[PDB]
Protein backbone atom coordinates (compact mmCIF):
# COMPACT_ATOMS: atom_id res chain seq x y z
CA UNK A 89 0.00 0.00 0.00
CA UNK A 90 1.61 3.25 -1.25
CA UNK A 91 0.30 6.81 -1.62
CA UNK A 92 0.25 8.38 -5.13
CA UNK A 93 3.07 10.56 -6.46
CA UNK A 94 2.80 14.44 -6.66
CA UNK A 95 3.43 16.16 -10.10
CA UNK A 96 4.77 19.76 -10.22
CA UNK A 97 3.11 23.13 -9.49
CA UNK A 98 3.34 26.59 -7.85
CA UNK A 99 2.77 28.28 -4.35
CA UNK A 100 -0.89 29.21 -3.66
CA UNK A 101 -2.34 27.09 -6.44
CA UNK A 102 0.14 24.50 -7.63
CA UNK A 103 -1.39 22.57 -10.44
CA UNK A 104 -4.19 25.05 -10.53
CA UNK A 105 -2.00 27.16 -12.84
CA UNK A 106 -0.65 24.62 -15.38
CA UNK A 107 -4.19 23.35 -15.40
CA UNK A 108 -5.81 26.70 -16.35
CA UNK A 109 -3.21 27.47 -19.01
CA UNK A 110 -3.96 24.33 -20.97
CA UNK A 111 -6.46 21.88 -19.34
CA UNK A 112 -6.22 19.35 -22.14
CA UNK A 113 -2.39 19.37 -22.16
CA UNK A 114 -2.17 19.08 -18.43
CA UNK A 115 -4.45 16.04 -18.41
CA UNK A 116 -2.54 14.19 -21.16
CA UNK A 117 0.70 14.93 -19.26
CA UNK A 118 -0.42 13.42 -15.89
CA UNK A 119 -0.57 10.12 -17.76
CA UNK A 120 3.14 9.39 -17.47
CA UNK A 121 3.59 10.68 -13.89
CA UNK A 122 2.07 7.29 -12.98
CA UNK A 123 -1.14 5.29 -12.97
CA UNK A 124 -2.30 7.49 -10.09
CA UNK A 125 -0.80 10.74 -8.99
CA UNK A 126 -1.70 13.39 -6.48
CA UNK A 127 -2.18 16.97 -7.57
CA UNK A 128 -2.81 20.12 -5.60
CA UNK A 129 -5.52 22.48 -6.64
CA UNK A 130 -4.66 25.32 -4.41
CA UNK A 131 -4.94 24.10 -0.83
CA UNK A 132 -6.78 20.81 -1.44
CA UNK A 133 -5.36 17.64 -2.96
CA UNK A 134 -7.01 15.51 -5.58
CA UNK A 135 -6.09 12.13 -7.01
CA UNK A 136 -5.65 11.58 -10.71
CA UNK A 137 -6.26 8.13 -12.19
CA UNK A 138 -4.62 8.04 -15.68
CA UNK A 139 -4.83 4.34 -16.55
CA UNK A 140 -7.69 2.67 -18.54
CA UNK A 141 -7.75 -0.27 -16.05
CA UNK A 142 -7.94 1.85 -12.93
CA UNK A 143 -10.46 4.25 -14.53
CA UNK A 144 -12.79 1.37 -15.22
CA UNK A 145 -12.37 0.18 -11.68
CA UNK A 146 -13.09 3.74 -10.73
CA UNK A 147 -16.45 3.80 -12.49
CA UNK A 148 -17.52 0.25 -11.68
CA UNK A 149 -16.84 0.52 -7.98
CA UNK A 150 -19.92 1.84 -6.17
CA UNK A 151 -17.62 3.16 -3.41
CA UNK A 152 -17.44 6.36 -5.46
CA UNK A 153 -33.61 6.26 -9.44
CA UNK A 154 -34.62 3.35 -11.69
CA UNK A 155 -37.47 5.72 -12.55
CA UNK A 156 -35.36 6.95 -15.45
CA UNK A 157 -34.38 3.46 -16.75
CA UNK A 158 -37.74 2.68 -18.48
CA UNK A 159 -37.50 5.87 -20.58
CA UNK A 160 -33.96 5.27 -21.89
CA UNK A 161 -33.85 1.45 -22.26
CA UNK A 162 -33.42 -0.02 -25.75
CA UNK A 163 -37.13 -0.68 -25.76
CA UNK A 164 -38.22 2.92 -25.30
CA UNK A 165 -36.07 4.29 -28.11
CA UNK A 166 -37.74 2.58 -31.09
CA UNK A 167 -40.76 4.65 -30.07
CA UNK A 168 -38.91 7.92 -30.16
CA UNK A 169 -37.64 7.00 -33.62
CA UNK A 170 -40.28 8.96 -35.58
CA UNK A 171 -39.45 12.25 -33.86
CA UNK A 172 -35.73 11.51 -34.39
CA UNK A 173 -36.19 10.86 -38.12
CA UNK A 174 -38.42 13.92 -38.28
CA UNK A 175 -35.95 16.30 -36.66
CA UNK A 176 -33.06 14.96 -38.67
CA UNK A 177 -34.59 15.25 -42.15
CA UNK A 178 -35.90 18.66 -41.16
CA UNK A 179 -32.30 19.81 -40.77
CA UNK A 180 -31.66 18.56 -44.26
CA UNK A 181 -34.10 21.15 -45.65
CA UNK A 182 -33.35 23.82 -43.08
CA UNK A 183 -29.76 23.84 -44.29
CA UNK A 184 -29.22 24.54 -47.96
CA UNK A 185 -26.18 24.40 -50.25
CA UNK A 186 -24.13 27.60 -50.29
CA UNK A 187 -25.28 28.98 -46.93
CA UNK A 188 -22.90 28.52 -44.02
CA UNK A 189 -24.19 26.73 -41.02
CA UNK A 190 -23.52 28.20 -37.59
CA UNK A 191 -22.55 25.00 -35.82
CA UNK A 192 -22.75 26.33 -32.24
CA UNK A 193 -26.16 27.86 -32.82
CA UNK A 194 -27.59 25.15 -35.07
CA UNK A 195 -26.19 22.12 -33.15
CA UNK A 196 -27.51 23.40 -29.84
CA UNK A 197 -30.97 23.73 -31.30
CA UNK A 198 -31.23 20.24 -32.83
CA UNK A 199 -30.05 19.01 -29.46
CA UNK A 200 -32.81 20.66 -27.46
CA UNK A 201 -35.53 19.66 -29.93
CA UNK A 202 -34.59 15.98 -30.10
CA UNK A 203 -34.30 15.69 -26.33
CA UNK A 204 -37.39 17.71 -25.48
CA UNK A 205 -39.61 16.23 -28.15
CA UNK A 206 -38.80 12.59 -27.46
CA UNK A 207 -38.59 12.82 -23.67
CA UNK A 208 -41.68 15.11 -23.61
CA UNK A 209 -44.57 15.24 -26.11
CA UNK A 210 -47.30 17.81 -26.89
CA UNK A 211 -47.14 21.57 -26.38
CA UNK A 212 -44.02 22.68 -28.10
CA UNK A 213 -41.00 24.02 -26.42
CA UNK A 214 -39.82 24.81 -29.93
CA UNK A 215 -37.69 27.91 -30.07
CA UNK A 216 -38.46 29.12 -26.62
CA UNK A 217 -36.57 26.31 -24.87
CA UNK A 218 -33.68 26.64 -27.35
CA UNK A 219 -33.13 30.35 -26.69
CA UNK A 220 -33.25 30.13 -22.90
CA UNK A 221 -30.87 27.20 -23.00
CA UNK A 222 -28.69 29.20 -25.39
CA UNK A 223 -28.33 32.36 -23.34
CA UNK A 224 -27.48 30.10 -20.41
CA UNK A 225 -24.77 27.95 -22.02
CA UNK A 226 -22.93 31.15 -23.01
CA UNK A 227 -23.12 32.53 -19.47
CA UNK A 228 -21.02 29.56 -18.40
CA UNK A 229 -18.15 29.78 -20.91
CA UNK A 230 -16.99 33.31 -20.14
CA UNK A 231 -34.16 36.57 -18.31
CA UNK A 232 -33.46 33.08 -19.56
CA UNK A 233 -33.36 31.02 -16.40
CA UNK A 234 -36.76 32.26 -15.32
CA UNK A 235 -38.25 31.34 -18.65
CA UNK A 236 -36.64 27.94 -18.45
CA UNK A 237 -38.24 27.35 -15.01
CA UNK A 238 -41.38 29.02 -16.23
CA UNK A 239 -41.57 26.78 -19.25
CA UNK A 240 -40.55 23.59 -17.39
CA UNK A 241 -43.39 24.10 -14.97
CA UNK A 242 -45.95 25.17 -17.53
CA UNK A 243 -45.06 22.14 -19.64
CA UNK A 244 -45.47 19.72 -16.74
CA UNK A 245 -48.89 21.22 -15.99
CA UNK A 246 -50.04 20.33 -19.50
CA UNK A 247 -49.19 16.62 -19.54
CA UNK A 248 -51.27 16.38 -16.40
CA UNK A 249 -54.34 16.62 -18.69
CA UNK A 250 -53.84 13.40 -20.71
CA UNK A 251 -50.43 11.69 -20.71
CA UNK A 252 -51.67 8.14 -21.25
CA UNK A 253 -49.01 6.36 -23.34
CA UNK A 254 -46.26 9.04 -22.83
CA UNK A 255 -43.47 6.57 -22.06
CA UNK A 256 -41.26 9.62 -22.16
CA UNK A 257 -39.33 10.56 -19.11
CA UNK A 258 -41.94 13.16 -18.01
CA UNK A 259 -44.58 10.46 -17.53
CA UNK A 260 -42.00 8.10 -16.16
CA UNK A 261 -41.15 10.93 -13.71
CA UNK A 262 -44.78 11.50 -12.80
CA UNK A 263 -45.33 7.98 -11.58
CA UNK A 264 -42.43 7.63 -9.09
CA UNK A 265 -42.38 15.16 -4.90
CA UNK A 266 -43.82 18.34 -6.44
CA UNK A 267 -40.74 20.32 -7.36
CA UNK A 268 -38.55 17.25 -7.45
CA UNK A 269 -39.92 16.54 -10.96
CA UNK A 270 -39.42 20.05 -12.24
CA UNK A 271 -35.82 19.73 -11.05
CA UNK A 272 -35.15 16.19 -12.25
CA UNK A 273 -36.37 17.37 -15.63
CA UNK A 274 -34.42 20.58 -15.73
CA UNK A 275 -31.44 18.60 -14.52
CA UNK A 276 -31.59 15.89 -17.16
CA UNK A 277 -32.40 17.95 -20.21
CA UNK A 278 -29.87 20.69 -19.55
CA UNK A 279 -26.54 18.73 -19.68
CA UNK A 280 -27.79 16.21 -22.19
CA UNK A 281 -28.53 18.97 -24.66
CA UNK A 282 -25.28 20.80 -24.45
CA UNK A 283 -23.55 17.40 -24.50
CA UNK A 284 -25.22 16.04 -27.67
CA UNK A 285 -24.87 19.51 -29.23
CA UNK A 286 -21.10 19.66 -28.69
CA UNK A 287 -20.94 16.17 -30.12
CA UNK A 288 -22.84 17.24 -33.20
CA UNK A 289 -20.44 20.11 -33.79
CA UNK A 290 -17.50 17.67 -33.89
CA UNK A 291 -19.45 15.40 -36.23
CA UNK A 292 -19.99 18.32 -38.65
CA UNK A 293 -16.29 18.96 -38.38
CA UNK A 294 -15.56 15.31 -39.20
CA UNK A 295 -17.82 15.30 -42.31
CA UNK A 296 -16.09 18.40 -43.70
CA UNK A 297 -12.52 17.29 -42.84
CA UNK A 298 -12.99 13.75 -44.12
CA UNK A 299 -15.08 13.69 -47.32
CA UNK A 300 -13.96 10.11 -47.82
CA UNK A 301 -16.08 8.84 -44.93
CA UNK A 302 -18.76 11.40 -45.48
CA UNK A 303 -19.43 9.78 -48.85
CA UNK A 304 -18.66 6.24 -47.67
CA UNK A 305 -21.48 6.95 -45.26
CA UNK A 306 -23.72 8.07 -48.09
CA UNK A 307 -22.98 4.80 -49.90
CA UNK A 308 -23.77 2.72 -46.86
CA UNK A 309 -27.06 4.62 -46.35
CA UNK A 310 -28.23 4.50 -49.95
CA UNK A 311 -27.65 0.75 -50.02
CA UNK A 312 -29.68 0.09 -46.92
CA UNK A 313 -32.24 2.85 -47.38
CA UNK A 314 -32.58 2.58 -51.15
CA UNK A 315 -33.85 6.14 -51.31
CA UNK A 316 -36.33 6.47 -48.50
CA UNK A 317 -35.23 8.98 -45.85
CA UNK A 318 -33.18 7.09 -43.21
CA UNK A 319 -35.18 5.61 -40.28
CA UNK A 320 -34.56 4.07 -36.85
CA UNK A 321 -34.51 0.58 -38.31
CA UNK A 322 -31.87 1.68 -40.70
CA UNK A 323 -29.57 3.04 -38.03
CA UNK A 324 -29.06 -0.45 -36.65
CA UNK A 325 -27.47 -1.40 -40.00
CA UNK A 326 -25.34 1.67 -40.79
CA UNK A 327 -22.12 0.37 -39.28
CA UNK A 328 -19.66 2.73 -40.95
CA UNK A 329 -21.79 5.68 -39.93
CA UNK A 330 -21.49 4.45 -36.36
CA UNK A 331 -17.71 4.10 -36.57
CA UNK A 332 -17.24 7.65 -37.73
CA UNK A 333 -19.24 8.86 -34.72
CA UNK A 334 -17.23 6.80 -32.26
CA UNK A 335 -13.96 7.87 -33.79
CA UNK A 336 -15.08 11.49 -33.68
CA UNK A 337 -16.16 11.10 -30.03
CA UNK A 338 -12.89 9.41 -29.09
CA UNK A 339 -10.67 12.26 -30.28
CA UNK A 340 -13.07 15.04 -29.19
CA UNK A 341 -15.38 13.96 -26.39
CA UNK A 342 -17.84 16.49 -25.06
CA UNK A 343 -17.20 15.25 -21.54
CA UNK A 344 -13.39 15.38 -21.14
CA UNK A 345 -13.16 15.15 -17.28
CA UNK A 346 -15.00 13.15 -14.63
CA UNK A 347 -14.86 13.28 -10.80
CA UNK A 348 -15.44 10.84 -8.00
CA UNK A 349 -15.34 10.90 -4.23
CA UNK A 350 -14.08 7.98 -2.18
CA UNK A 351 -16.51 6.93 0.59
CA UNK A 352 -14.35 4.30 2.26
CA UNK A 353 -10.54 4.14 2.29
CA UNK A 354 -9.58 2.37 -0.88
CA UNK A 355 -6.82 0.70 -2.87
CA UNK A 356 -6.16 1.27 -6.63
CA UNK A 357 -3.27 -0.12 -8.66
CA UNK A 358 -1.45 -0.89 -5.43
CA UNK A 359 -2.00 2.69 -4.30
CA UNK A 360 -3.95 3.85 -1.31
CA UNK A 361 -6.84 6.16 -1.96
CA UNK A 362 -7.54 7.99 1.31
CA UNK A 363 -11.08 7.75 2.56
CA UNK A 364 -13.21 10.74 1.53
CA UNK A 365 -10.78 11.63 -1.28
CA UNK A 366 -11.50 13.65 -4.33
CA UNK A 367 -10.47 11.88 -7.44
CA UNK A 368 -10.33 12.96 -11.08
CA UNK A 369 -9.72 11.47 -14.50
CA UNK A 370 -9.88 12.50 -18.12
CA UNK A 371 -11.70 10.46 -20.78
CA UNK A 372 -10.07 12.87 -23.16
CA UNK A 373 -6.54 11.73 -22.31
CA UNK A 374 -7.50 8.07 -22.02
CA UNK A 375 -9.05 8.05 -25.49
CA UNK A 376 -5.96 9.70 -27.00
CA UNK A 377 -3.32 7.74 -25.04
CA UNK A 378 -0.56 6.13 -27.20
CA UNK A 379 -0.32 3.00 -24.96
CA UNK A 380 -3.97 2.25 -25.75
CA UNK A 381 -4.22 3.35 -29.35
CA UNK A 382 -2.07 2.54 -32.35
CA UNK A 383 -2.46 5.63 -34.56
CA UNK A 384 -2.87 7.74 -31.47
CA UNK A 385 -4.12 10.95 -33.14
CA UNK A 386 -5.23 9.67 -36.52
CA UNK A 387 -8.88 10.03 -37.38
CA UNK A 388 -9.64 6.50 -38.42
CA UNK A 389 -13.28 5.22 -38.14
CA UNK A 390 -11.99 1.81 -39.08
CA UNK A 391 -9.87 1.31 -35.92
CA UNK A 392 -13.12 0.16 -34.48
CA UNK A 393 -12.96 -2.82 -36.79
CA UNK A 394 -13.31 -6.16 -34.89
CA UNK A 395 -9.67 -7.10 -35.37
CA UNK A 396 -8.28 -3.73 -34.30
CA UNK A 397 -11.08 -3.04 -31.83
CA UNK A 398 -9.91 -5.97 -29.69
CA UNK A 399 -6.44 -4.43 -29.81
CA UNK A 400 -7.61 -1.56 -27.60
CA UNK A 401 -7.95 -1.81 -23.72
CA UNK A 402 -11.31 -2.57 -22.11
CA UNK A 403 -12.28 0.83 -20.59
CA UNK A 404 -10.16 2.98 -22.91
CA UNK A 405 -13.25 3.97 -24.87
CA UNK A 406 -16.14 4.69 -22.57
CA UNK A 407 -17.82 7.98 -23.61
CA UNK A 408 -20.52 6.96 -21.17
CA UNK A 409 -19.38 5.19 -17.89
CA UNK A 410 -20.19 1.60 -16.60
CA UNK A 411 -21.48 1.75 -12.96
CA UNK A 412 -24.85 3.37 -12.16
CA UNK A 413 -23.40 6.89 -12.57
CA UNK A 414 -23.45 6.05 -16.32
CA UNK A 415 -25.25 7.65 -19.18
CA UNK A 416 -28.94 6.56 -19.41
CA UNK A 417 -29.06 7.96 -22.93
CA UNK A 418 -26.26 5.89 -24.36
CA UNK A 419 -28.81 4.18 -26.66
CA UNK A 420 -30.90 7.28 -27.14
CA UNK A 421 -27.77 9.27 -27.98
CA UNK A 422 -26.15 7.04 -30.57
CA UNK A 423 -29.61 6.54 -32.11
CA UNK A 424 -30.25 10.22 -32.85
CA UNK A 425 -26.61 11.01 -33.71
CA UNK A 426 -26.55 8.13 -36.21
CA UNK A 427 -29.78 9.29 -37.79
CA UNK A 428 -28.74 12.90 -38.09
CA UNK A 429 -25.27 12.01 -39.46
CA UNK A 430 -26.58 9.60 -42.13
CA UNK A 431 -29.38 11.97 -43.09
CA UNK A 432 -26.85 14.78 -43.55
CA UNK A 433 -23.98 12.93 -45.33
CA UNK A 434 -26.38 11.30 -47.76
CA UNK A 435 -27.95 14.52 -48.98
CA UNK A 436 -24.80 16.62 -48.66
CA UNK A 437 -21.09 16.91 -48.71
CA UNK A 438 -19.55 19.22 -46.17
CA UNK A 439 -16.89 21.82 -46.46
CA UNK A 440 -15.38 24.17 -43.95
CA UNK A 441 -15.69 27.87 -44.59
CA UNK A 442 -12.34 29.65 -44.65
CA UNK A 443 -12.24 31.61 -41.42
CA UNK A 444 -13.84 28.72 -39.59
CA UNK A 445 -12.32 28.36 -36.13
CA UNK A 446 -12.47 24.64 -35.36
CA UNK A 447 -10.02 25.14 -32.46
CA UNK A 448 -11.13 23.40 -29.29
CA UNK A 449 -12.66 25.50 -26.50
CA UNK A 450 -12.50 23.88 -23.08
CA UNK A 451 -15.56 24.64 -20.98
CA UNK A 452 -18.26 22.47 -19.44
CA UNK A 453 -17.84 20.25 -22.48
CA UNK A 454 -15.31 20.45 -25.27
CA UNK A 455 -16.49 22.26 -28.35
CA UNK A 456 -15.11 24.17 -31.38
CA UNK A 457 -14.67 27.91 -30.83
CA UNK A 458 -16.33 28.86 -34.13
CA UNK A 459 -16.84 26.11 -36.70
CA UNK A 460 -18.39 27.30 -39.98
CA UNK A 461 -19.46 24.79 -42.55
CA UNK A 462 -21.37 24.92 -45.81
CA UNK A 463 -23.38 22.03 -47.16
CA UNK A 464 -22.45 21.29 -50.76
CA UNK A 465 -24.87 19.46 -53.13
CA UNK A 466 -23.95 15.76 -53.33
CA UNK A 467 -25.70 14.36 -56.40
Ligand code: HEM
Pocket residue numbers: 147203275276277278279280281283284285287342343346347407408409412413414415416417420421
Ligand atom coordinates in the same frame (compact mmCIF):
# COMPACT_ATOMS: atom_id res chain seq x y z
C1 HEM B 1 -23.20 13.45 -26.48
C2 HEM B 1 -23.68 12.11 -26.00
C3 HEM B 1 -23.54 11.91 -24.49
C4 HEM B 1 -22.38 11.56 -23.77
C5 HEM B 1 -20.99 11.28 -24.35
C6 HEM B 1 -22.76 11.49 -22.36
C7 HEM B 1 -21.88 11.16 -21.28
C8 HEM B 1 -22.18 11.06 -19.90
C9 HEM B 1 -21.27 10.72 -18.79
C10 HEM B 1 -19.76 10.41 -18.97
C11 HEM B 1 -22.03 10.77 -17.60
C12 HEM B 1 -21.63 10.52 -16.09
C13 HEM B 1 -20.43 9.70 -15.74
C14 HEM B 1 -19.98 9.95 -14.31
O1 HEM B 1 -19.83 11.11 -13.90
O2 HEM B 1 -19.79 8.90 -13.63
C15 HEM B 1 -23.41 11.12 -17.98
C16 HEM B 1 -24.49 11.28 -17.10
C17 HEM B 1 -25.84 11.62 -17.38
N1 HEM B 1 -26.33 11.90 -18.67
FE1 HEM B 1 -25.26 11.67 -20.44
N2 HEM B 1 -24.15 11.81 -22.23
C18 HEM B 1 -24.62 12.08 -23.53
C19 HEM B 1 -25.97 12.43 -23.81
C20 HEM B 1 -27.05 12.58 -22.88
C21 HEM B 1 -28.43 12.96 -23.25
C22 HEM B 1 -28.93 13.24 -24.71
C23 HEM B 1 -29.17 12.98 -22.08
C24 HEM B 1 -30.67 13.31 -21.88
C25 HEM B 1 -31.06 14.77 -22.07
C26 HEM B 1 -28.25 12.64 -20.98
C27 HEM B 1 -28.56 12.54 -19.59
C28 HEM B 1 -27.70 12.21 -18.52
C29 HEM B 1 -28.06 12.11 -17.10
C30 HEM B 1 -29.46 12.38 -16.53
C31 HEM B 1 -26.92 11.77 -16.39
C32 HEM B 1 -26.80 11.54 -14.85
C33 HEM B 1 -26.69 10.03 -14.43
C34 HEM B 1 -26.55 9.85 -12.93
O3 HEM B 1 -26.98 10.71 -12.12
O4 HEM B 1 -25.95 8.80 -12.60
N3 HEM B 1 -26.95 12.39 -21.48
N4 HEM B 1 -23.47 11.29 -19.37
